[PDB]
Subunit: 139 residues, 10 copies
């Protein structure tokens, strides 16, 4: 029953800061009732998100997210049953990680990948999860 | 011969505070002589209980409990020999786990299951045990 | 939700070949619709039985069996989720293990226990399951 | 790069044998160019399918499949990188598993689940995988 | 010459007195050092549980002498095997009495490892026996 | 209760005769089967090596009776522990004698598990004792680990 | 000191069957004296090779190979100590893997990758090694 | 694609402190843009270097390094995918290890090798990695 | 008294000839049985590789005596450790020569475990040494 | 090629503190250039020593040591490749372990063997190693010939 899904996506070219906010707010409104928790990362132009909850709800949320016009080319990175949650304190939270980010954040990206800018297509599922767990500790 | 049994059951629709007090008083009277220790949670309408002791005593106790008119449809979740007890401090303790429960407790439910309401049907034996271990810590 | 339960019980002194056949017919009548499979051994006066199927069904069947006048003092030996069935070929089958059994059967009894009569009380869960597995492959 | 996705779905109530022939024809036409292999099972009313190929390809194929009108409520059971393929010999194969199937097949379904009828919602990723591997071997 | 450990349990004769246990301790503290024996004895009326460590020949000589003692019967070897290192090396022998008058802490410890609050070795496996003995040694 | 194995060695008294060995084995055959004891006794003059398997209470009753026997001394428990299943199918009615008059096959077997072609339990570990005993039971078709 | 090195590279655009022959002949000439064994696959335009031998020899051979004007952009996929050889019967053997290959070979390529064309740059070390073992097996020679 | 390569080299006989500084300057200039991290140890006349980064980049850098006239006889000690970086705080750092090194440093060299002087071409992958990690913490 | 194995390599003197190896074998086959020693010797000019099995004391007596032999020098103990059971128990000693004129099957076995077709014990670890000696024993 | 060799031997009857001092002086002279480290214990009449270094060096040193007229009947206890040294701090350390040793040291002997007197023949290689590691941890100085602990 308890499941996790990690996926990456391509946000549309002309995304603004307000759009990230619109996504965060919607997720923070819908997720609690569905028992969904997780963490969303935006590294222009890419999204990386982890979702935790029961299987039915994880799948409902995921398949509804894919219909969002603000991104395309979704790539499911990992989907499996889990023993326990790691993001249970957040309905959803949003972190931007890019070329202007601090050395501490850049060094985390580098720790799990080939460069200092976050590229989900360049990481396996273990590196994706670990990156997310570590970035969760910074703020 | 040292054993653990975890089960869940459906409490009757009528259960008042006094019924929970009666169960707890009975278990605290009977369990010490029988070398039984453990923990009972009530998440309306369901019970989740763990019992530890010598195999014959755990079985005697469990089969007596199944005859109780205050619940039905008992579902053994796990019954196994164990190396050492984990609930040795309590002949029996009883905890209500519901929507009125504290943030800490609700988050613990969420850690091991799809929602913030405790539903033993939604969890495997490992998640049941870990939940019970962690809530026992809180109490 | 796939589960196995193994228990032992004390059959009443009265028991005749026809009682075993009655039990067999009853289990072969009820088990298929309930998705239950397994194996019953009778070693005067002890029974040893393994039940496999969905959690809800295994429990309904088990708790029904305890109510049977023909045995008493049930002892759950193991109850746990399983990856796959081992006794799937029969809804139920019944074997008598005694001094008139084949040498091959007597040897299997001795393999997993202290005497050449099957006494489940003495046997741990791995010994019970292995005995049942071994005797099922000969029959 | 090399990935496998297993999912289940609900087929529309009015599915004919011609519809399964149709689905099979499209997948046998589309899958080779995209390097997709696997197996589809239909147990009325549900589908169970495994897809193998490079991550980008598996994702393209799956997300196209979910936007198909002949089924709904897709539930991804597992999506992960894999060491090597298991269904490489078929671009796609379609097997119907129901109450009319062979006793061999029925016993197989029962080996991995609570019942003789295939119900993916009741199965974990390992049980799904092994069922699909075993039924493929008998075909 | 190999380093060994033997854990066994036995039944004390009815009406063993605190003095008999003192006599057992005194003899063991006199004999064990010269034979290189270390370990721990626990008495939970009517039962004894003892662990002995030392060289194979000495552990065996000591054990088979102990079985001849009129103060207990029906000895049950729980485990006897070569060991990597001792755990009771600081004591030639110690004796601990565990009953219904022992501390809440001790009683909880007995319960952690077995089916009741009185110690019944015949019910515990070798790993439970050793770890109980290790844990009880630690608090005393 | 629990299934157990015990392996021990001892020193036969100096002047032990074939009739004495026969008497021991006649006793063993009389008692062991009824008591659910399987295993084998080996004699490599002047030493004995035996393996007992069965219920813990029974293995212990049998062993402690053996230690009181005036025909041997200085018994050494080599191993005693719970086991998952038996490795000996029967109580072996015969005595296996292992000595300088043994067959080349048997001597090579002794050598396989120890420093010499004569069986010396004091120089073997529990695994070596167990495997030697299993292998020789197999050679004598008494046998074969189920 | 026994080692394996697996790498991939880009063959030159103007590569001909004759060049494949010269490489194989040079390899068969040099490899025995240096204790090198292994296997070379060519999937236009890519080479995939495994080399086994003493670390010093594997490294001498590898670094000489990278200087060859017949390929560029070498990608070491794995280099590590090994317990025993897996390709000891061949000093060097060459196999072309393409669209004219047997269906059995095509199916083998698919078993370890996304497509029926061999693309080394899309296979992890375990996949490369297992592909090469399997393909050596379906072929023959010593 | 995240990789690590460890190798050893023989520096030319004539190398001066200025040559080492030139190597370091070049590497700190080039490595960042290529996402390369690591550590270089010089134990006259030998080099031992660890490189981390994307497979393509590690390989580009490595093969460029082998073309350098200041060293010869390169020996790849290990090259493999990695879970995460261990260097990463450094584009590149250089440490000289010799007869004038600290007692602590000489004892570390001895801990991993036959002598107080580092002989890179004599240590296995595990010894190389751990030596490098250990000496990184000392400085 | 512990059962032991020791594997070592050495350098034979330059002028060694077939008779020398025959004298080594005959001496080994004479001495080893009474000492309970088993094993196998390979000579790959100029190198010897030998495995010895037996009781710790005897393995050591034999080895330290072998090292005093004028027919070889620079001995390198490759491994020495207690063992669970013997693998060469059927031979007091055997001697095998492995050279550039051995069978291809033997030369390939050499190659399976090392950098070359000539046996060089210095080029192999304890596992490769043991496995080679086991495999070459089986094919003889 | 990093190796460890542990052996025991019987010292000749007459050995004096000066003989032990001579052995240590010799080992501390030779071991450094050979990259050898380790630890020697003397429990009259027996020696127990562990040597670490490159395989060739451990072997050269060992076989030279067996030629020493001050001991006989050497018994190799274990000889095998190692991943890392454990005795790297001293080219050689030497400790007398006997019945005039401290209770702390006697308890260590008992921890790994039948008695409080060190008898290498009564210990398996893991016991020898761990005993040597534990004694290395509590000493100190390069020897206890001048001052104990
Ligand atoms: C990258 C991305 C991630 C999203 N994650 C979530 C999510 O975690 N939970 C959620 O409810 N909506 C998520 N959404 C937003 C939903 O797609 C959609 O806007 C929402 O269902 C609309 O809810 P509303 O109509 O109540 O505002 C995400 C959107 C984007 C593009
Ligand atoms: C869910 C639940 C849990 C119970 N747990 C225990 C228990 O741990 N021990 C016990 O003796 N009785 C337990 N009981 C109560 C028994 O069923 C029964 O009422 C009690 O043992 C009667 O003893 P008394 O008549 O002496 O009061 C439980 C009952 C319920 C319904
Ligand atoms: C030891 C034993 C094992 C039994 N096993 C089963 C069983 O596997 N399935 C079942 O339906 N009934 C089993 N029963 C029989 C039931 O207790 C009961 O007789 C049966 O449900 C009556 O069904 P019927 O009215 O159709 O005959 C068992 C009874 C005994 C004593
Ligand atoms: C249960 C199910 C499984 C399907 N599996 C595949 C598949 O494996 N590959 C594929 O290309 N289409 C698959 N489809 C069919 C596609 O959704 C759809 O028919 C296709 O994109 C159009 O094919 P066409 O070329 O015939 O128009 C599946 C459909 C259903 C409902
Ligand atoms: C349960 C129990 C444990 C004993 N433990 C030891 C022991 O560890 N060491 C010992 O020498 N005697 C032990 N004995 C005592 C011996 O049986 C016996 O009294 C002793 O050999 C007599 O020595 P003494 O005559 O010098 O007093 C134990 C006795 C009992 C009943
Ligand atoms: C070395 C040796 C091994 C023995 N093994 C057994 C045995 O396994 N089982 C047994 O009952 N008696 C065994 N005994 C014999 C007993 O000590 C005792 O003599 C015998 O059980 C008496 O039984 P009886 O009165 O029927 O003759 C053994 C004796 C010796 C010396
Ligand atoms: C992809 C490829 C693989 C090669 N493999 C080997 C090899 O395994 N062994 C070898 O000696 N040369 C190999 N070479 C050839 C060498 O680079 C080089 O041509 C060789 O040293 C020439 O030797 P020769 O002058 O004696 O002919 C390979 C070349 C290519 C491009
Ligand atoms: C032992 C050694 C290690 C080197 N490491 C690196 C390195 O990590 N990164 C790098 O870019 N160049 C490295 N080089 C230097 C390159 O070979 C080359 O000199 C340099 O990249 C030229 O860059 P520049 O022209 O910008 O100065 C190394 C050279 C040597 C001899
Ligand atoms: C490489 C080599 C291996 C040897 N192996 C053995 C051996 O296994 N057993 C043995 O007794 N002597 C062995 N020797 C021979 C002894 O060194 C020595 O010649 C022997 O003690 C002479 O015995 P003899 O005087 O009875 O002939 C070996 C010698 C060499 C050089
Ligand atoms: C038990 C014992 C241990 C020894 N350990 C070493 C050693 O670790 N290193 C060493 O060089 N010599 C060791 N020796 C000393 C050598 O046998 C020999 O006396 C010494 O190497 C001669 O060197 P010197 O002439 O410079 O004094 C040891 C001797 C004994 C008896």
């Amino acid at each position: 029953s308890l499941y996790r899904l990690i996926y990456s996506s391509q946000g549309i070219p002309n995304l603004q800061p307000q759009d990230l906010k619109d996504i965060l707010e919607s997720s923070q409104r819908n997720n609690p009732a569905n028992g969904i928790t997780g963490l969303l990362c935006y590294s222009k132009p890419a999204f990386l998100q982890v979702l935790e909850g029961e299987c039915e709800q994880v799948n409902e949320t995921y398949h509804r997210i894919v219909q969002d016009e603000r991104h395309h080319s979704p790539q499911i990175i990992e989907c499996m049953p889990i023993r326990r949650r790691n993001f249970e304190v957040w309905s959803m939270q949003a972190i931007t990680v890019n070329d202007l980010s601090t050395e501490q954040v850049k060094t985390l990206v580098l720790k799990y990948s080939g460069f200092t800018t976050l590229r989900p297509s360049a990481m396996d599922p273990e590196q994706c999860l670990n990156f997310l767990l570590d970035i969760a500790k910074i703020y």
